[PDB]
Amino acid sequence: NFARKLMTQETVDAVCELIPSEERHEALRELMDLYLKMKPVWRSSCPAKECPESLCQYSFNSQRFAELLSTKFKYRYEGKITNYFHKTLAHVPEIIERDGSIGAWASEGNQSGNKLFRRFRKMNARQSKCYEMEDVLKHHWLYTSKYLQKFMNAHNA
Amino acid sequence: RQHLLSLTRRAQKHRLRELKIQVKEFADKEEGGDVKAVCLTLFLLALRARNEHRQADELEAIMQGRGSGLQPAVCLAIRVNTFLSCSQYHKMYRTVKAITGRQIFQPLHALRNAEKVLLPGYHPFEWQPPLKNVSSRTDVGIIDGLSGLASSVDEYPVDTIAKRFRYDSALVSALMDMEEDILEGMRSQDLDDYLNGPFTVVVKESCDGMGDVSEKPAVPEKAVRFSFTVMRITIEHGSQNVKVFEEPKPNSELCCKPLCLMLADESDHETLTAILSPLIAEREAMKSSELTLEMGGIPRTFKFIFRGTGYDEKLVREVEGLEASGSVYICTLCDTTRLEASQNLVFHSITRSHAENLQRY
Amino acid sequence: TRRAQKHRLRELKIQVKEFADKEEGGDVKAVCLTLFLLALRARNEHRQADELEAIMQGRGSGLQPAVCLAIRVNTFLSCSQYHKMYRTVKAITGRQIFQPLHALRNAEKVLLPGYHPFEWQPPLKNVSSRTDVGIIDGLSGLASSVDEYPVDTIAKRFRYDSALVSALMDMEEDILEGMRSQDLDDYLNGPFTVVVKESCDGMGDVSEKHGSGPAVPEKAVRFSFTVMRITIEHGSQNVKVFEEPKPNSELCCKPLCLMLADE
Ligand SMILES: [Ca+2]
Ligand SMILES: [Ca+2]
Ligand SMILES: [Zn+2]
């Protein structure tokens, strides 16, 4: 939520009042602008059909972003460059043409299971360190079966 | 004599006993030995002749059909999707039955005997061609995750608890737990329900420790969950294949099914290997077979393709065979120095298989 | 079909028709319902037996919002999961039996102090004669500012009178049954002498965190009372129209105040 909230154009508008130079203004404007222009490809669940105009932009829209990262910002991205930038720069369209989407095949689906694991440990337990995960696994499976959630989504006339 | 409803427990019985037995034995001598069905139908007729069709219609609904009260699957679903413990559920049950006279919730033994159809390990199936190193019994639920790793004071000390299914057991249980969806897909895509062509299933895996889940000088513990989810089901029909099953939300929380979980680390490499290696053994085993089981009427067949993807970045740097994160070779797909990415930015390709890393090792 | 059994079993029609006519004289509805109920009771499927007894008794499907509140709070459920249970039994049964949350709050504020009228015949100096007052702060207007002594204790409180009238009104069927059972009428005035014992206890620490490990010992303490004995002197003697069967339980100690401090 913090990650989504921090990325606004208006945040660039807010930091522009704390920096003097016009050069830095237009540089940061282009930076966040290109990042938001290139976001939704790897973000969605079906970008090959849902937002497919920004699909074919991505090579061009990444190359200019990389180049103005080089020239305008060689103070920092001359030696070390972090690897996630290399991943989001040079390997997205090969993967997309290989494998359809990206944001489907994510680790989002499990990492939110912390609340389910914690609550199941708290409220449905027997505290014997051998069953104490057995019933957790049983309830966790019994949650995520679809035959039951069909009953829970009944209010959908 | 006063009224049948003012009469006590066997007062009405011994009052109209002779009439009762004479018409009952006349009926079961008349209509081939059943009195309940014919008596209920004539009671419906005798009530509904008196312009009271409402009670007759709801009675015809609830007998030979649904209506008031709940199926056991309903009450199980609403027990689990509110995370209520058993005892409070029992109290809710007993006070509802005490207030309304009816029986809408189900009792707890009736709950478990409808539960056992929904775990892994219930339904028969046949692996063909069969699987080496795999016990062929189809009555497998919870076993211990250690695979009976002998653990005494002379061997390596272990400290972890892990419970798991087997892979095929949870896989067929997840397959039978979406019969409605696959039959809906086959109905909607102008196919025939009587088709047992070799479906292809594509399945996503995932594994990310969930450390610091401890509960009480504070010493912590960690835990690792290994999990999967059916993602896309298709069938090669004629000269093309066609999807019977996609997903609305792939990375949902309520559609990520567990497979194994352990009270260990993501960095304690020994225990992690010794637990997860049966699972990777079975995973390698069922990549060259067909699966056969009864799916609502006709039995059908299956194949598989796996894509272990949902590992984060640190784990896939730790199990596939790379070094730690702060290396010089950074891309887990290409092979370039960190220093190289500063000069050339975007011109590589994916060039890292699995067996290539085996031969490089 | 409908006509098939009507022709095949018109013999049973005329048979039980005339036999109810000659036994007790024509109540084909009652004998036919009792005979079908005995036919299905014998199958040991008694859920259908008392469901039919309920529907021909004319029982109601839904229930009290008050008993909905009781079953809600005695399972410790949030409002959210209650909405889940409400909507699922609505969509499954077709008829609505559990109740929405408007009725729960509305039946709820019936029970709190501050809904009924009440009066004192002496005027009660320094006591706010407003009757619409429930939960207010226990600080009684204490300044905790930087110019004053520093306090931190969060206080929640009623007034003593409104809680007393609520705890006397909620036991109304107890005192009515005491009036019937101990041989008196409904139309008997008091004055009822009320034995109220009082208590206050600290509870140790009441918190736990996850963030920075060792958390703080938040000490807490509530102040509480108990209605335990309702007496009335009429005639010559007095009669204990309510004795509490067990005053030291965890169901009969109504609270007054909560504060987060040490004893
Ligand atoms: Ca994580
Ligand atoms: Ca991780
Ligand atoms: Zn690369």
| Residue in B with minimal Cα distance to C1 | B41
Is C51 in Cβ contact with B100 (below 8 Å)?
no
Is A90 in Cβ contact with B334 (below 8 Å)?
yes
Of B210, B223, B346, the CB nearest to A66: B346
Mutation site, C3, C31, C37, interface B, largest B CB count within 10 A? C31
Is C91 in Cβ contact with A154 (below 8 Å)?
yes
CB B226 within 8 A of CB B319: no
Residues of chain C found within 8 Å of residue A151, distances taken between Cβ atoms: 88, 92
Mutation site, A148, A155, A156, interface C, largest C CB count within 10 A? A155
DSSP for residue C124: -
CA angle B304, B310, B311 (to 5 degrees): 120
Burial classification of residue A47, based on how many CB atoms lie within 10 Å of its CB (0-12 exposed, 13-18 middle, 19 or more buried): buried
Measured between alpha carbons, how far is C170 from C112 in angstroms, rounded to an integer?
A: 10
Measured between alpha carbons, how far is A93 from A97 in angstroms, rounded to an integer?
A: 6
Structure tokens at B10: 């066997």
Measured between alpha carbons, how far is B304 from C223 in angstroms, rounded to an integer?
A: 66
Q: CB pairs below 8 Å between A and C: how many?
A: 13
**Helix A131-144 with B72-80: angle, nearest 10 deg:** 110
Structure tokens at C72: 């809600």
Dihedral sign for Cα atoms in the order A18, A21, A24, A28: positive
Is C40 in Cβ contact with B23 (below 8 Å)?
no
Instruction: Give every CB contact of residue C207 below 8 A, 6+ residues apart in sequence.
Output: C215, C216, C218
Instruction: Give every CB contact of residue C56 below 8 A, 6+ residues apart in sequence.
Output: B55, C33
- Identify residue A74 by its one-letter amino acid code: K
**Interruption sites in chain C after residues (C→N beyond 2.5 Å):** none
E strand or H helix at C83, and its extent? helix C79-93
Instruction: Chain B: give the shortest CA distance to residue A17, in Å.
Output: 31
Measured between alpha carbons, how far is B341 from B329 in angstroms, rounded to an integer?
A: 10
Instruction: Chain C: give the shortest CA distance to residue B103, in Å.
Output: 7
Rg (CA), chain B: 30
Among A72, C205, C49, smallest CA distance to B101 is for C49
Residue linked to tokens 């679903």: B77
Among A21, A96, A85, smallest CA distance to A55 is for A96
CA angle C191, C197, C201 (to 5 degrees): 155
φ/ψ of B123, rounded to 5, equals -115, 145
| Residue in B with minimal Cα distance to A124 | B85
Among B309, B208, B328, B322, smallest CA distance to B265 is for B208
Instruction: Chain A: give the shortest CA distance to residue B319, in Å.
Output: 17
CA angle C220, C225, C226 (to 5 degrees): 135
* Structure resolution, Å: 4.3
Instruction: Give every CB contact of residue B300 below 8 A, 6+ residues apart in sequence.
Output: B196, B197, B199, B292, B293, B294
Structure tokens at A138: 């049983």
Structure tokens at A112: 């939110």
Is B68 in Cβ contact with C51 (below 8 Å)?
yes
Largest Cα separation within chain C, whole Å, is 99
Residue B89 half-sphere exposure toward CB, CA atoms < 13 A: 22
Rg (CA), chain A: 23
Q: How far is the CA of B336 from the centre of ligand 3 (A)?
A: 6
Residue linked to tokens 């999967």: B228
CA dihedral in degrees (B39, B41, B44, B48; nearest 10)? -130
Is C77 in Cβ contact with B42 (below 8 Å)?
no
**C-alpha of B115 from chain center:** 11
Burial classification of residue A81, based on how many CB atoms lie within 10 Å of its CB (0-12 exposed, 13-18 middle, 19 or more buried): buried
Q: State the DSSP string of A11-70.
A: HHHHHTTS---HHHHHHHHHHHHHHHHHHHHHHSS-TTTSSTHHHHHHHHHHHHHHHHHH
Classify C227 as helix, strand or coil: strand
Q: State the DSSP string of C175-217.
A: HHHHHHHTT--SS---PEEEEEEEEEEEEEE----SSSSS---
Residues of chain C found within 8 Å of residue A123, distances taken between Cβ atoms: none
Is C93 in Cβ contact with B68 (below 8 Å)?
yes
Structure tokens at B353: 């298989």
CA angle B157, B313, B343 (to 5 degrees): 135
- Identify residue B246 by its one-letter amino acid code: E
Measured between alpha carbons, how far is B347 from B343 in angstroms, rounded to an integer?
A: 11
Is C16 in Cβ contact with B19 (below 8 Å)?
yes
Whether chain B has a CB inside 8 Å of the CB on C45: the answer is no
DSSP for residue C82: H
Q: In b/e form, how buried is each residue of C80-115, taking b as 16+ CB within 10 angstroms?
A: ebbebbbbbbbbbbeeebbbebeebeebeeeeebbe
Structure tokens at B279: 């699972």
CA angle B152, B154, B159 (to 5 degrees): 45
Measured between alpha carbons, how far is B200 from B182 in angstroms, rounded to an integer?
A: 12
φ/ψ of B235, rounded to 5, equals -150, 130
Q: Which residues surround ligand 3, an ion (CB under 5 A)?
A: B 331, 334, 348
Q: How far is the CA of A109 from the centre of ligand 2 (A)?
A: 13
Structure tokens at C209: 């965190």
CB A70 within 8 A of CB B345: yes
Structure tokens at B157: 């000390």
Measured between alpha carbons, how far is A32 from A9 in angstroms, rounded to an integer?
A: 7
Q: In b/e form, how buried is each residue of B5-16, taking b as 16+ CB within 10 angstroms?
A: eebeeeebeebb
Q: In b/e form, how buried is each residue of B213-242, taking b as 16+ CB within 10 angstroms?
A: beeeeeeeebbbbbbbbbbbbbbeeeeeee
E strand or H helix at C46, and its extent? helix C46-57
Measured between alpha carbons, how far is C138 from A98 in angstroms, rounded to an integer?
A: 67
Whether chain A has a CB inside 8 Å of the CB on C4: the answer is no
Q: What is the 3-state secondary structure (H, E, C) of chain B?
A: CCCCCCCCCCHHHHHCHHHHHHHHHHHHCCCCCCCHHHHHHHHHHHHHCCCCHHHHHHHHHHCCCCCCCCCHHHHHHHHHCCCCCHHHHHHHHHHHHHHHCCCCCCCHHHHHHHHCCCCCCCCCCEEECCCCCCCCCCCCCCEECCCCCCCCCCCCCCCCCEEECCHHHHHHHHHHCCHHHHHHHHHHCCCCCCCCCCEEEEEEEEECCCCCCCCCCCCCCCCEEEEEEEEEEEEEECCEEEEEECCCCCCCCCCCEEEEEECCCCCCHHHHHHHHHHHHHHHHHCCCCEEEEECCCCEEEEEEEEEECCCCCCCHHHHCCCCCCCCCECCCCCCCEHHHHHHCCCCCCCCCCCHHHHHHC
E strand or H helix at C238, and its extent? strand C237-243
Measured between alpha carbons, how far is B152 from A132 in angstroms, rounded to an integer?
A: 23
Largest Cα separation within chain B, whole Å, is 105
**C-alpha of B29 from chain center:** 48
CB C256 within 8 A of CB C223: yes
φ/ψ of B206, rounded to 5, equals -160, 150
Instruction: Chain A: give the shortest CA distance to residue B235, in Å.
Output: 18
Measured between alpha carbons, how far is B332 from B345 in angstroms, rounded to an integer?
A: 16
Measured between alpha carbons, how far is C64 from C66 in angstroms, rounded to an integer?
A: 5
Which residues partner with B118 through β-bridges? none
Of C5, C53, C64, the CB nearest to B41: C5
Q: Sort residue C127 into left (φ over 0), alpha (ψ -120 to 50) or beta.
A: beta
Strands (E), C32-160: 136-137, 155-157
| Residue in B with minimal Cα distance to C66 | B99
Instruction: Give every CB contact of residue B71 below 8 A, 6+ residues apart in sequence.
Output: none
Instruction: Give every CB contact of residue C113 below 8 A, 6+ residues apart in sequence.
Output: C134, C158, C159, C162, C163, C165, C166
Instruction: Give every CB contact of residue C260 below 8 A, 6+ residues apart in sequence.
Output: C152, C153, C154, C206, C218, C219, C220
Among B41, B90, B103, B61, smallest CA distance to C48 is for B103
Is C74 in Cβ contact with B91 (below 8 Å)?
yes
Residues of chain B found within 8 Å of residue C5, distances taken between Cβ atoms: 38, 41-42, 45
Whether chain A has a CB inside 8 Å of the CB on C95: the answer is no
Q: How many residues does chain B have?
A: 361
Q: Which ligand is nearest to the CA of A88?
A: 3
- The answer to whether B181 is a known ligand-binding residue is no
Instruction: Chain C: give the shortest CA distance to residue A124, in Å.
Output: 14
Q: How far is the CA of A111 from the centre of ligand 1 (A)?
A: 5
Measured between alpha carbons, how far is C235 from C46 in angstroms, rounded to an integer?
A: 53
Residues of chain A found within 8 Å of residue C92, distances taken between Cβ atoms: 151, 154
Measured between alpha carbons, how far is B1 from B151 in angstroms, rounded to an integer?
A: 78
Measured between alpha carbons, how far is B309 from A107 in angstroms, rounded to an integer?
A: 8
| Residue in C with minimal Cα distance to B11 | C34
Reply yes or no: is the peptide bond before residue C191 cis, omega within 30 of 0: yes
Measured between alpha carbons, how far is B136 from B121 in angstroms, rounded to an integer?
A: 12
Residues of chain B found within 8 Å of residue C35, distances taken between Cβ atoms: 16, 20, 23, 39, 43
Is A151 in Cβ contact with C87 (below 8 Å)?
no
Is C91 in Cβ contact with A155 (below 8 Å)?
yes
Residue A107 half-sphere exposure toward CB, CA atoms < 13 A: 18
φ/ψ of C89, rounded to 5, equals -80, -25
Instruction: Give every CB contact of residue B85 below 8 A, 6+ residues apart in sequence.
Output: A123, A124
CA dihedral in degrees (B114, B118, B121, B124; nearest 10)? 90
Measured between alpha carbons, how far is A151 from C92 in angstroms, rounded to an integer?
A: 8
Of B58, B82, B218, the CB nearest to C85: B82
Instruction: Chain A: give the shortest CA distance to residue B290, in Å.
Output: 24
Residues of chain C found within 8 Å of residue B82, distances taken between Cβ atoms: 77, 81, 84-85
Among C191, A143, A67, smallest CA distance to B343 is for A67
Mutation site, B225, B229, B306, B329, interface A, largest A CB count within 10 A? B225
